[PDB]
Amino acid sequence: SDPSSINGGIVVAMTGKDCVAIACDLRLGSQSLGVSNKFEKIFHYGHVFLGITGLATDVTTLNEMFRYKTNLYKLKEERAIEPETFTQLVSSSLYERRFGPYFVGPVVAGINSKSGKPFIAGFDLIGCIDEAKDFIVSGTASDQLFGMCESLYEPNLEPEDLFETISQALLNAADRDALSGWGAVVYIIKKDEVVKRYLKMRQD
Amino acid sequence: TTTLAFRFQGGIIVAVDSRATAGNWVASQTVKKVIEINPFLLGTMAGGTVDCQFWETWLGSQCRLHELREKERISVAAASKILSNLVYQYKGAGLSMGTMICGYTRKEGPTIYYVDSDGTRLKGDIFCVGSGQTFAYGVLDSNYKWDLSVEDALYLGKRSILAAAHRDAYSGGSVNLYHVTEDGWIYHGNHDVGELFWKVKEEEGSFNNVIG
Amino acid sequence: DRGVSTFSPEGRLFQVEYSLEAIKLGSTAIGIATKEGVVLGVEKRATSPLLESDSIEKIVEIDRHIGCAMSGLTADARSMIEHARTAAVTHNLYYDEDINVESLTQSVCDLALRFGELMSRPFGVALLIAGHDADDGYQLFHAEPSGTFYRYNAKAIGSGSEGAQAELLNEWHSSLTLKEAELLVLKILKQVMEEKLDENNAQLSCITKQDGFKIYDNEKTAELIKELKEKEAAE
Amino acid sequence: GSRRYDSRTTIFSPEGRLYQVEYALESISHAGTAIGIMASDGIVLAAERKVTSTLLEQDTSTEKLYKLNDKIAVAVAGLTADAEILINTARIHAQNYLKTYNEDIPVEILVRRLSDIKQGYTQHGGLRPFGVSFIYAGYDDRYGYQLYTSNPSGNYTGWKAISVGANTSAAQTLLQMDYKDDMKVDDAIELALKTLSKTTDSSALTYDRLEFATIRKGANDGEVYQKIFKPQEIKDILVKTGIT
Amino acid sequence: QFNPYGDNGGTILGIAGEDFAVLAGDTRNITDYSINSRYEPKVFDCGDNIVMSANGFAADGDALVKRFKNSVKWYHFDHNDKKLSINSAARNIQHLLYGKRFFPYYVHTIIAGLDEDGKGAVYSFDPVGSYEREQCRAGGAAASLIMPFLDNQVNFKNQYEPGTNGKVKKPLKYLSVEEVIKLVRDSFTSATERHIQVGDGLEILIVTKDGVRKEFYELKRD
Amino acid sequence: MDIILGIRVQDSVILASSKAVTRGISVLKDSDDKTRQLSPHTLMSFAGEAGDTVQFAEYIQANIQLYSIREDYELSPQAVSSFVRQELAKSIRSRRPYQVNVLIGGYDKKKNKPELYQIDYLGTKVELPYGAHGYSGFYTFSLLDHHYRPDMTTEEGLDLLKLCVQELEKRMPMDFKGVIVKIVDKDGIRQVDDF
Amino acid sequence: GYDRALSIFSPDGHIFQVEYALEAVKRGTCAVGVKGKNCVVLGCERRSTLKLQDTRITPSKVSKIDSHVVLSFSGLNADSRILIEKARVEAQSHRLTLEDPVTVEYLTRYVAGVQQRYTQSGGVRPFGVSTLIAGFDPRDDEPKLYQTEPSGIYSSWSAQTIGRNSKTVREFLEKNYDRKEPPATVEECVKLTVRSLLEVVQTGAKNIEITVVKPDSDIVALSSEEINQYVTQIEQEKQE
Amino acid sequence: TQQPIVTGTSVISMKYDNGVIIAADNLGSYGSLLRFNGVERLIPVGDNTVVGISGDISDMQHIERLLKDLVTENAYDNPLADAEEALEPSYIFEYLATVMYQRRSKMNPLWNAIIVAGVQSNGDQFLRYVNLLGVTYSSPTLATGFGAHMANPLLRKVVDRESDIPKTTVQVAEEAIVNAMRVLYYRDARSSRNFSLAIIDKNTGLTFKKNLQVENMKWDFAKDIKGYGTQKI
Amino acid sequence: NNYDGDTVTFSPTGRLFQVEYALEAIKQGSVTVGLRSNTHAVLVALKRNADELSSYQKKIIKCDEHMGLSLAGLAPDARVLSNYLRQQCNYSSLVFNRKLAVERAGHLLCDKAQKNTQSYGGRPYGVGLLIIGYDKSGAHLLEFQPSGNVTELYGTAIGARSQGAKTYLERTLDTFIKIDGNPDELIKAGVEAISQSLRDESLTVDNLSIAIVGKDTPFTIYDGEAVAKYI
Numbered sequence A: 001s002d003p004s005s006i007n008g009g010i011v012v013a014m015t016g017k018d019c020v021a022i023a024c025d026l027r028l029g030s031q032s033l034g035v036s037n038k039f040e041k042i043f044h045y046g047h048v049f050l051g052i053t054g055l056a057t058d059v060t061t062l063n064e065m066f067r068y069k070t071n072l073y074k075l076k077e078e079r080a081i082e083p084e085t086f087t088q089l090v091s092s093s094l095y096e097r098r099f100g101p102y103f104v105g106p107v108v109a110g111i112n113s114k115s116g117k118p119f120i121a122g123f124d125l126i127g128c129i130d131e132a133k134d135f136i137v138s139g140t141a142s143d144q145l146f147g148m149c150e151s152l153y154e155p156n157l158e159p160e161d162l163f164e165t166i167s168q169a170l171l172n173a174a175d176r177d178a179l180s181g182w183g184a185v186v187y188i189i190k191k192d193e194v195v196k197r198y199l200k201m202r203q204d
Numbered sequence B: 001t002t003t004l005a006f007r008f009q010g011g012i013i014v015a016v017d018s019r020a021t022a023g024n025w026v027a028s029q030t031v032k033k034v035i036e037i038n039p040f041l042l043g044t045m046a047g048g049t050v051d052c053q054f055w056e057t058w059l060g061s062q063c064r065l066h067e068l069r070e071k072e073r074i075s076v077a078a079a080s081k082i083l084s085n086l087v088y089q090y091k092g093a094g095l096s097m098g099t100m101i102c103g104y105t106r107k108e109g110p111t112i113y114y115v116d117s118d119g120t121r122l123k124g125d126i127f128c129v130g131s132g133q134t135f136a137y138g139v140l141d142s143n144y145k146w147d148l149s150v151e152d153a154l155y156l157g158k159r160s161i162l163a164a165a166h167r168d169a170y171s172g173g174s175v176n177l178y179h180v181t182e183d184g185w186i187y188h189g190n191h192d193v194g195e196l197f198w199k200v201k202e203e204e205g206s207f208n209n210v211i212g
Numbered sequence C: 001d002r003g004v005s006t007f008s009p010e011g012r013l014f015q016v017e018y019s020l021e022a023i024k025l026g027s028t029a030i031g032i033a034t035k036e037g038v039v040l041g042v043e044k045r046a047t048s049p050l051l052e053s054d055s056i057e058k059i060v061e062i063d064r065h066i067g068c069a070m071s072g073l074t075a076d077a078r079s080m081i082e083h084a085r086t087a088a089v090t091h092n093l094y095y096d097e098d099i100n101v102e103s104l105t106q107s108v109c110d111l112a113l114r115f116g117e118l119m120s121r122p123f124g125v126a127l128l129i130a131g132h133d134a135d136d137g138y139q140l141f142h143a144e145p146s147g148t149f150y151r152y153n154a155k156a157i158g159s160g161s162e163g164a165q166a167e168l169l170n171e172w173h174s175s176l177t178l179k180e181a182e183l184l185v186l187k188i189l190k191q192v193m194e195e196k197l198d199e200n201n202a203q204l205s206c207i208t209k210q211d212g213f214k215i216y217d218n219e220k221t222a223e224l225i226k227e228l229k230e231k232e233a234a235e
Numbered sequence D: 001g002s003r004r005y006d007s008r009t010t011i012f013s014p015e016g017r018l019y020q021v022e023y024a025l026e027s028i029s030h031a032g033t034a035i036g037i038m039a040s041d042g043i044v045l046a047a048e049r050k051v052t053s054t055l056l057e058q059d060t061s062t063e064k065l066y067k068l069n070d071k072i073a074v075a076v077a078g079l080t081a082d083a084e085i086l087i088n089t090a091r092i093h094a095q096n097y098l099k100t101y102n103e104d105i106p107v108e109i110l111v112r113r114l115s116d117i118k119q120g121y122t123q124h125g126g127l128r129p130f131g132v133s134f135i136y137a138g139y140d141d142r143y144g145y146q147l148y149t150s151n152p153s154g155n156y157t158g159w160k161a162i163s164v165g166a167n168t169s170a171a172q173t174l175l176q177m178d179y180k181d182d183m184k185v186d187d188a189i190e191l192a193l194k195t196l197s198k199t200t201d202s203s204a205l206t207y208d209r210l211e212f213a214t215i216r217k218g219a220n221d222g223e224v225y226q227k228i229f230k231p232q233e234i235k236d237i238l239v240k241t242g243i244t
Numbered sequence E: 001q002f003n004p005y006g007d008n009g010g011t012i013l014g015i016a017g018e019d020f021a022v023l024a025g026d027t028r029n030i031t032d033y034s035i036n037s038r039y040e041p042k043v044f045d046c047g048d049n050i051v052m053s054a055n056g057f058a059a060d061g062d063a064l065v066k067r068f069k070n071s072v073k074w075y076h077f078d079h080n081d082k083k084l085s086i087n088s089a090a091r092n093i094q095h096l097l098y099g100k101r102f103f104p105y106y107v108h109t110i111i112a113g114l115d116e117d118g119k120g121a122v123y124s125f126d127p128v129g130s131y132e133r134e135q136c137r138a139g140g141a142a143a144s145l146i147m148p149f150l151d152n153q154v155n156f157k158n159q160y161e162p163g164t165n166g167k168v169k170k171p172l173k174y175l176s177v178e179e180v181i182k183l184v185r186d187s188f189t190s191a192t193e194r195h196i197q198v199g200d201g202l203e204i205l206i207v208t209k210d211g212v213r214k215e216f217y218e219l220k221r222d
Numbered sequence F: 001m002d003i004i005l006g007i008r009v010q011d012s013v014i015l016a017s018s019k020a021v022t023r024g025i026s027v028l029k030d031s032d033d034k035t036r037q038l039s040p041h042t043l044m045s046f047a048g049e050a051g052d053t054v055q056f057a058e059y060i061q062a063n064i065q066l067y068s069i070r071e072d073y074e075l076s077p078q079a080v081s082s083f084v085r086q087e088l089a090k091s092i093r094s095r096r097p098y099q100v101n102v103l104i105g106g107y108d109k110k111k112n113k114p115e116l117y118q119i120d121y122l123g124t125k126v127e128l129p130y131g132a133h134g135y136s137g138f139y140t141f142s143l144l145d146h147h148y149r150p151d152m153t154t155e156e157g158l159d160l161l162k163l164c165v166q167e168l169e170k171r172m173p174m175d176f177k178g179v180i181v182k183i184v185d186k187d188g189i190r191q192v193d194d195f
Numbered sequence G: 001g002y003d004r005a006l007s008i009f010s011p012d013g014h015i016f017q018v019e020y021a022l023e024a025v026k027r028g029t030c031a032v033g034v035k036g037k038n039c040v041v042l043g044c045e046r047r048s049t050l051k052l053q054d055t056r057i058t059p060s061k062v063s064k065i066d067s068h069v070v071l072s073f074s075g076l077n078a079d080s081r082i083l084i085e086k087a088r089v090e091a092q093s094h095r096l097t098l099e100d101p102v103t104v105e106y107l108t109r110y111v112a113g114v115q116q117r118y119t120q121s122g123g124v125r126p127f128g129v130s131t132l133i134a135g136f137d138p139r140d141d142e143p144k145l146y147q148t149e150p151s152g153i154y155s156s157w158s159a160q161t162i163g164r165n166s167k168t169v170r171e172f173l174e175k176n177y178d179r180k181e182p183p184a185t186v187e188e189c190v191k192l193t194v195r196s197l198l199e200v201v202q203t204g205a206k207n208i209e210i211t212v213v214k215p216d217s218d219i220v221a222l223s224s225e226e227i228n229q230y231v232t233q234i235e236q237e238k239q240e
Numbered sequence H: 001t002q003q004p005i006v007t008g009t010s011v012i013s014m015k016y017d018n019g020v021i022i023a024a025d026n027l028g029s030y031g032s033l034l035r036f037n038g039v040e041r042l043i044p045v046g047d048n049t050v051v052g053i054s055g056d057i058s059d060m061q062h063i064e065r066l067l068k069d070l071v072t073e074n075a076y077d078n079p080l081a082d083a084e085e086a087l088e089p090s091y092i093f094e095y096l097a098t099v100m101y102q103r104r105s106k107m108n109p110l111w112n113a114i115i116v117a118g119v120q121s122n123g124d125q126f127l128r129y130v131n132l133l134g135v136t137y138s139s140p141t142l143a144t145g146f147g148a149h150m151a152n153p154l155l156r157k158v159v160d161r162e163s164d165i166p167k168t169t170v171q172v173a174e175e176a177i178v179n180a181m182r183v184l185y186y187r188d189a190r191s192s193r194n195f196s197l198a199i200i201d202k203n204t205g206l207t208f209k210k211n212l213q214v215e216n217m218k219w220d221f222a223k224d225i226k227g228y229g230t231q232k233i
Numbered sequence I: 001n002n003y004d005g006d007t008v009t010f011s012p013t014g015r016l017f018q019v020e021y022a023l024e025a026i027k028q029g030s031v032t033v034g035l036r037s038n039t040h041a042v043l044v045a046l047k048r049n050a051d052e053l054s055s056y057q058k059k060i061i062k063c064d065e066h067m068g069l070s071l072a073g074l075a076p077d078a079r080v081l082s083n084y085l086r087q088q089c090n091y092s093s094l095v096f097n098r099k100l101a102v103e104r105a106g107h108l109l110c111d112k113a114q115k116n117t118q119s120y121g122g123r124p125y126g127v128g129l130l131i132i133g134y135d136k137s138g139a140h141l142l143e144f145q146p147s148g149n150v151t152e153l154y155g156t157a158i159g160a161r162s163q164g165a166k167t168y169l170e171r172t173l174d175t176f177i178k179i180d181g182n183p184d185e186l187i188k189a190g191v192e193a194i195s196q197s198l199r200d201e202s203l204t205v206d207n208l209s210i211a212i213v214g215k216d217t218p219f220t221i222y223d224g225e226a227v228a229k230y231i
Ligand SMILES: *[B]([O])([O])[C]([C][C]([C])[C])[N]C(=O)[C]([C]C1=[C][C]=[C][C]=[C]1)[N]C(=O)C1=[C]N=[C][C]=N1
Pocket: B001, B002, B019, B020, B021, B022, B023, B027, B031, B033, B045, B046, B047, B048, B049, B052, B130, B131, B170, B171, E126
């Protein structure tokens, strides 16, 4: 009945020293029934990464919508959109559906190509921007993720250390949520290289 | 209501009852539940009264316009789909319909389409629709064959409505029979259930449970 | 330039008067009304011998009790026929009866003056509407793009109209049979047509109370042409 | 009333020609020449900027060559402002197709859509047509490398090599002479520049008076790269081919 | 919350004879347990030898009769003063009712007259436009009290011929206008006794080839 | 309607769909084909609310057939599935949404690969080796999880499908009157007339 | 909106905009239609003023409206696309509602109705296009060939031509086509169609397109070499 | 759909030999609060019609403005506005009845019950009722709200049927109306002592009486009533 | 000349030529006469045929039980205007239970025709109308011109040769106004009036059209053998 917890799923993002990390589970369900273990929730438009939790049809629809908009942006501007600018575009796009909203929990992550500054941001289903220095959480196990991140996190972690922290935050949060799990992916993002790692986790 | 229609060697048999009810009150025992769309096409009536009358008469206007425009008899498939597409537009609004569109053309042969106010459109050989449909199905399924004579097929339809008229409280009054061939339908009379029951009981040896 | 709905100094609508000129260029159509039925006949006028003449449809059914023949820009007639058929069927739906021939004609004529700056111009086609009803019996109407309609005992429209009308003036009487009317249409069509009249370049039709509106077969018309030739040679 | 002042842009002449379309084509014939040449391993787009100035900022300037998506580009001949209206429509159409089918729009489908828009302005609405002719250079996995053109009438046709704008008659003759089917991109680059160099109304062909672009499978492995040439890169290819 | 419907009570009765037709109705109008009027005409002459009554919610009843009367007027204008036949009037009324299928005229409509062969005709409608020609029909409040009596005394249902014991039915002999009026009066007298919304007065409209005649009779006023 | 299954093997896609149509109390038909051919190498099965199912399926069919004629080209299964998803994703926020779930089985002639797409009435699309809608997956997925291997033959796929149908016929309360099975491969679409 | 009446009558009873649309058809490349006993052939002229053309991708002159009906045209190319699109949409709409593909006569009647509508609608000009529509009705083996024109009139033809120099090829067809015995085979029908175009075309190289339509959705376009063999055989018989 | 806020109670009326009488109290109630004590609920239209209104007062004031506008409109391009082509009671009623039914059909009713009393051109008495549902009826006596339950029984004893109308004088009719108003004051908890009365006669025209009061009331017997049963003191 | 292209254009002398050209269409139409007494009002109309095979075009139209008109000019424009009157008469009856006054019916026709003379795109009506009726102020006769001008009269005539009938009525004014309670004599006077406009042709059984409305007489049209009595 509650649109935001029909399909299930989670996303988490973190900042480190000259790097950012964004991670998600791979589950798609119909309430109790597990349907797919390959439903990735992180997308990227140029160097800007976007994770989206919530109702799966809207996750897909919004990805297609932002691909659409960032492609037109690039043709007109003659440059790739930056994380700060994209964050504003997500907020604008969600709020235009104020009274008929997409049931989603987006998360932006990336490094500004000019300043080199790491950036993350979160949103509610209707556009409000949460721009945290440390971390952002989203999805059906957001409470769990808040608890993990708040204890595990420390500032200025090196890329390979940050990987371990965000991975352990996701995995242990997902294992305390019935509608999350069935696999996981972690993106480590530096100024001009991005590594993608699939994690081994329990499949129940 | 009990309405049926079935395909066989000799074409299509259509048989309906005559009763209309408002709650437990019997409003009418003389209802024409078969609509003569044209000399070749019949429609049955079940559910709410007006809806099936109004829109199947309307269907006859659309069929007449088709054959005026196309200089050719409308197919049963096309005629049934005009009605189903129309009611699908009204889906949710509260129409109440269960009908069989029956006809016989060169390209199709004898054809029956079950059309429904939820939008359902099904082609088939045997259909029973209404509050007494289950009673009529019993008699049909056990006695139906393809190689039935027009005489025997007519009786089976008459007998199946009687079965439902007896048991179903919201079915009864009288039975209207129709036989559909390629050259058109043929009316086979109004049969009062009050007289038909005692006649069938005596001649057939059935309804031994009832005293007469 | 000038308005489409403009009046001339004589008190006529320019566009309506010009559409009447287009009708004069059209192929001939004739109608004769009797107490036994109304007959409708047309000149097909194929532009080339390779054109399959049976595809030329200048006589058209509106309902079982009403038929129609056309002359002029025949493409313009399609929407008029569609409206006529719809009006006939719609009335039957609302009133469970056949529609009066006059009432049908009036409905068609209401379209005529719906043009301005609605459609951009008047119709460039005239219609002969023939039918039967219980109140006024066998009838023949002439529907113009002006919105006016006259009832006729007999009428000819198209390029050979004034010559044919003068012939209909002498030949028509109130005791004509259906057979006599059929031959009379054939006779007058043959008189005004450029090419020689046969079953392939001319078409007959009628409307009777019993059988309704019927377009004649080429075989049936061919016999009536042969019957005509013999009776003219008889004196 | 208002009828008095109406030019009636969408009417036939007694000869069966569309006045405004014909006059729009006359306008385009004075625009800078644009050339497209299709090869087996890519496509070339070359175009001449119209009588420029030394004070024009060339490196940030764009009047001829425009990007529709990653696979398709266009060369413009006519009113630049009119072309940008259509270009933005085409960019949107490509994105609509991508959103719907999750596949890049085939080149012809995009061309047909733009050409149909142009057609509409010649049949209804009473507005003037777009004074623009396009050369479409694009790639898809069905037909591979493709060249098309469209004009204000809304009619479009496919080409191996084609020119639009000024001196097309002279240009088309030179292309018809030296073009061969087994030609390569590097050869096509040379042909395009040589053709412009002979048809140009200017005294000499220089880097500051040109816009240049290539669509190559010369991208690392099975994929396509668009290259809009920079001023310095046009200067280098002019020296390489031996024009300056 | 606002309720757009109400119930004005009343009862109507149509009977078709061999060469005549009657449409009767009580003259009482009510809401709840109060009398609004002891004489409020309910059956109307609509022209073209057609009589009509729309029983139930009086506001919808008046609106419908008004619109049908209007339809008769425009039928004359549009079709050269042609007489609107009873079967055509019936079909027209179906479309008036179905036009408001999803916000219905809360009435039970009955019309009466002569068919095109001169025989008596009665048509009956439900609120949403379903209709059917009938020999006999009561409508409204006391319809359930009257119809069974008419099945027995007009169509001779469950009646057989003495001596045969159920074998031979009572033959369906035709009823005169005097005989029908007797059955109408007894139907309303009986309905008045057992139904609180029936009483005050009875107004009958009789239709023949000669035209439309009226008769009025007193009913109990309690 | 009720049960619709799909499985993708080495060189084909197999769709199985029940034959029963029930209007409340009675089973009106026991031979109903809950599928439409969208293109020569693309088949769509469907299940949902009465009327809406066929109306939607035929509407999609008409649109794909229109595309085929216009371009003289068959769309890829991936492209067709995306078109269908968008129509349902549009539908879910309409005045009256299409209450229809679909499986799209197609053979991509360009990549020479079979492809199975599962889409629900919300517009939720997933590519799968095997899929189902409604309660069908609750019974069958445990068997498919055990037995499916991605290099199966079409004959092995049909046997695994029989095992699924047998479990459904044992543990489901409703009598769905068997299934119509159809195979989609490089040669097109064909029906298995004995199952 | 723009409502100006562009198509109007003149004092002599002519609608000049419709007549000037026919002049645009006269300018268009020649198109020809011939129906045999069990087939219909559509021939089309390609003007050789345009070389360096890419024939793979260039819009072909014959268009499929459905799997069983084709449409060729003479006149404005851009205008023809609008009629073809509407016709294709209507063909699918007919299948959807009537559950049967369009007859050739019905499809023709629709296209002709569109053309007519543009002759008495405000703010629009007529289509500068005449069409030849050919094919076979569903489950029918009788060949069909119809013609339409800007005014909106349509009719059936045993054989017909439209476009530039259509007066000449119609002259050829009127003496060479026998109704009592039409081209019995595909070969005979194609041969007669190529012959008729050779009266007007110039070179028999890439200037002639041929499309053969047979019953039961059997439509195929002949290649250059296949047509070139007809061109060769015709002239070798002519040298006598 | 709304709820009535400020409301007016019963309107009562009857026919007599030469015309009609109508009456209504001057109170505007706000629930149980007797808020406004000077509200005129009889509204004359010309010299031949009086419209009596009960129910929602804001809707009454709207109807009052519609009638005022109706008189203005009838006078436009009408030389016989004060003679043959003056507004009749039957015209005024039919207009209101049309509006009431239209408004209920849009689910936004004028929350009122209305009685139009008057005399026609030919001298005939006119008296007809209409309410928020568009329901209409006529009778020798008519009354709204509580008047329907209490006034009608008293007024029907004077004029029980049509044949009793010529036998009823204006003195007898007014007496009955005034008595009914007293009874309503005894028994209606949303009524007031002050009321207005209007007579429309075919001979003497329109007589409009304001600031009438209920008089000759019986209350003295109250002094003897003690407790609710057993109490003696 | 330069100022007759459309209805939105005054001439230098302040004339509206399109309106005047519409007025010309009436003069080409067949003659029709109107006259009244204090009890009745009569319309007499000469119908026109196309030829001997054709019917005679109807000239009189009923608007209500108490009102109707006769036409001269474009017949379709009379159908549009008579349809409008039918609706207005009907709106008055349904809403106000009131028969529409003849004077007010003229005011409505005037205002409808006026809008067509001041706006671009449209055209004036090409027909003249003679409205008769009986309302609460007795019998009435109106004359409508498509310029918008409506006039109440005792008697009048419009169409071709209408001046002859108009002069006769101007002489007979004192006589026919007094014909009260005698319908046949009032019609006789109307038939004698329209006869002053005839040339070559005379009044035959299918040529003549008469209508009457009065105190206890609904608007009724007489054609065919019903008018042989008055020939
Ligand atoms: B039949 O019983 O379905 C019958 C068919 C109808 C066309 C005459 N329906 C009714 O009699 C219905 C009641 C009903 C009974 C059982 C199933 C469904 C419906 N009658 C009405 O809807 C009705 C409504 N108003 C007045 C009288 N009857």
